[PDB]
């Protein structure tokens, strides 16, 4: 007859969300308290990741309803506050600044701070950038909104690859489709131990340091035609940027308290030179073209470009971190033309007091780096927003970096967390031995 027969370990799963786990690479070369993403208790990963490919299975994906990108954005915020918890407060620095110019984008400001002794007062000088200071005869930019905790010079903001790994009893489903939606069914899915190397960069309008595509450029949104959500244009090839801060800055240590040392910018030496980035001209020229082909597939007419209309300074420019210093690059040279080594040069302005995530609270002061600064941007994606209601003859794609979950959705689009239900009931012709 047909009697039940329960099987333990059936390969069936359900769409359910759980909490992930950091697992960095076997690179414990610390030698200093560093790696604000890994911190002190992110475990080493598997040296041999057990990537397991499946067949005869088509599971639907939804990278905008993914809960991994909500959990990633909560951790990076949590790591940002946790690393700044023991760092030096800038409470006594919120005094009236006496600022005189150098010529420029730097003012020398002389202020009053208490020493380690609670009664003595010293007057010291410090180079402060122009957008770090609001007029009052000057003050810092947001001392009258919230407190400022400067970044500890020991730690580093270089994003190491961290693998978010589901606990035992769960799984992560990786889609292997070369040209894939974003949201929709995937013909080639593969369960993995956990994810690939993900660099938790912070960047607006330009997805730096990520994964590339294999076949061609994929344009991704919720449904594209809606103007309210940003469009993630995941590149195939990577253009080359050589960003720099080509002026010599000296780090000056200012005594503000017992153990609390305020590292400001000392006397500038050499040439007063602007920070610039070389985003080729030839690789970008072919890049926008190949972007045009994918954007013209989803439309029927010409597709133009235009720089960002407005907002805060951190979205109208191209923000990122370049060796512990936060840049703000003017990306008007990239997107101006109306589409259907002689390098282009981006004027980037440096800010130290940065209020990342725009959460009311800690806004860190990045200490200056001694000497020249050079980094290597790489671009594996773009962040574009469609324009409003116009005629059908052309459409405008303003660049824009919205909520930071759009950065993580460029790397967590492949993955999906499901729970494993190994109990399963299925009828068979077997019956156990009867009692009587």
């Amino acid at each position: 007859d047909l009697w039940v027969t329960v099987y333990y370990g059936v390969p069936v799963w359900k769409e359910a969300k759980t909490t992930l786990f950091c697992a960095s690479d076997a690179k414990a070369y610390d030698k200093e308290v560093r790696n604000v993403w890994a911190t002190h208790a992110c475990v080493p990963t598997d040296p041999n990741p057990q990537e397991i490919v499946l067949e005869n299975v088509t599971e639907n994906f939804n990278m905008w309803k993914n809960d991994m990108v909500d959990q990633m954005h909560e951790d990076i915020i949590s790591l940002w506050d946790q690393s700044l918890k023991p760092c030096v407060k800038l409470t006594p620095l919120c005094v009236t600044l006496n600022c005189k110019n150098v010529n420029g984008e730097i003012k020398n400001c002389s202020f009053n701070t208490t020493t380690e002794l609670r009664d003595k007062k010293q007057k010291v000088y410090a180079l402060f950038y122009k957008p770090d200071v609001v007029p009052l005869e000057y003050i810092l930019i947001n001392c009258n909104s919230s407190t400022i905790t400067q970044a500890c010079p020991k730690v580093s903001f270089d994003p190491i690859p961290i693998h978010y790994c589901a606990p035992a009893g769960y799984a992560i489903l990786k889609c292997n489709n070369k040209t894939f939606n974003g949201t929709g069914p995937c013909n080639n899915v593969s369960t993995v131990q956990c994810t690939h190397g993900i660099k938790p960069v912070v960047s607006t309008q330009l997805l730096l340091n990520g994964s590339l595509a294999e076949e061609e450029i994929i344009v991704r949104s919720e449904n594209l035609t809606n103007n309210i959500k940003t469009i993630i244009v995941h590149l195939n090839k990577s253009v080359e940027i050589n960003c720099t801060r080509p002026n010599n800055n000296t780090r000056k240590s200012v005594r503000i308290g017992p153990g609390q040392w305020f590292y400001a910018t000392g006397e500038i030496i050499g040439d007063i030179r602007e920070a610039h980035c070389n985003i080729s001209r030839e690789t970008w020229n072919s890049t926008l073209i190949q972007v045009k082909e994918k954007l013209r597939e989803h439309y029927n007419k010409t597709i133009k470009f235009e720089p960002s209309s407005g907002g805060d300074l951190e979205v109208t420019t191209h923000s990122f971190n370049c060796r512990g210093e936060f840049f703000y690059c003017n990306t008007t040279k990239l997107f101006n033309e109306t589409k259907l080594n002689k390098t282009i040069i981006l004027p980037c302005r440096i800010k130290q007091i940065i209020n990342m995530w725009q959460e009311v609270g800690r806004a860190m002061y990045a200490p200056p780096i001694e000497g020249n600064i050079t980094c290597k941007s790489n671009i594996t994606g773009l962040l574009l927003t469609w324009d409003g209601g116009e005629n059908s003859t052309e459409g405008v794609f303003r660049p824009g970096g919205g909520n930071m979950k759009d950065n993580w959705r460029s790397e967590l689009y492949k993955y999906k967390v499901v729970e494993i239900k190994p109990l399963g009931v299925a009828p068979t012709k077997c019956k156990r031995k009867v009692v009587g």
């Epitope: 035609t225 309210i228 209309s309 907002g311 805060d312 979205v315 725009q358 919205g402």
Partner: antibody, heavy 121, light 97 residues
């Protein structure tokens, strides 16, 4: 609770600038986008643009590009919209719109609207 | 390119029924009471938001949005707007005899 309250109605001369504010209370002001939409008294309602209060990230229709600037004051939960180069054809009632109490994450349509600000130039 | 008629007839007990054609037509419908801001009555052509009566409903087609209200009252006299993303319709005024 969870409402949008606008400023008083204004009548201005051509060429002058007007500022239509829209304060928000009772809900997460930052997390929800603030749309601005017109309605002329005797014409179809015309959509101006949207503005999310995280960084501002303003988006404009081409018929208002270069004339309207939307700023914000997130410390007091206020969303602004300032029109420059006002003309005779810029008469309507100006509504601030958002989407809070809906289960659709697509951002359209709107459900919660302001009290209204009739602007006649 | 979102068009709708201006006035359709009706009577208490007889359904008032509005067409609205266009690309992605009838994502949302608004009932603008005369004097104040409009109010959402249906979103995603057929789904019903909270705070509105059960008699408010809509039906979908290939390109035309059909808003059907059954059991009219005297207090429902308002202007009806058909919306599609950022676009909007012309506007339909209720007629109750």
């Amino acid at each position: 609770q969870v409402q949008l309250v606008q400023s008083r109605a204004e009548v201005k001369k051509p060429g002058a600038s007007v500022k239509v504010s829209c304060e928000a209370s009772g809900y997460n002001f930052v997390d929800h986008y603030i749309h601005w939409v017109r309605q002329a008294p005797g014409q179809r309602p015309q959509w101006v643009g949207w503005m999310n209060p995280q960084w501002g990230q303003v988006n404009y229709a081409r018929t208002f590009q270069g004339r309207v600037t939307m700023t914000r004051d997130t410390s007091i939960d206020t969303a602004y919209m300032q029109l420059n180069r006002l003309t005779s054809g810029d008469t309507a009632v100006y509504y601030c719109a958002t989407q809070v109490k809906l289960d659709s994450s697509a951002g359209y349509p709107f459900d919660i609207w302001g009290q209204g600000t009739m602007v006649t130039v | 390119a979102l068009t709708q008629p201006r006035s359709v007839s009706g009577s208490p007990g007889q359904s008032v029924n509005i067409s609205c054609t266009g690309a992605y037509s009838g994502l949302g419908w608004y009932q603008q009471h005369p004097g104040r801001a409009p109010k959402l009555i249906i979103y995603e052509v057929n789904r019903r938001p909270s705070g509105v009566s059960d008699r408010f409903s809509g039906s979908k087609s290939g390109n035309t949005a059909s808003l059907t209200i059954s059991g009219l009252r005297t207090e429902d006299e308002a202007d009806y707007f058909c919306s599609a993303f950022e676009y909007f319709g012309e506007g339909t005024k209720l007629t109750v005899l």
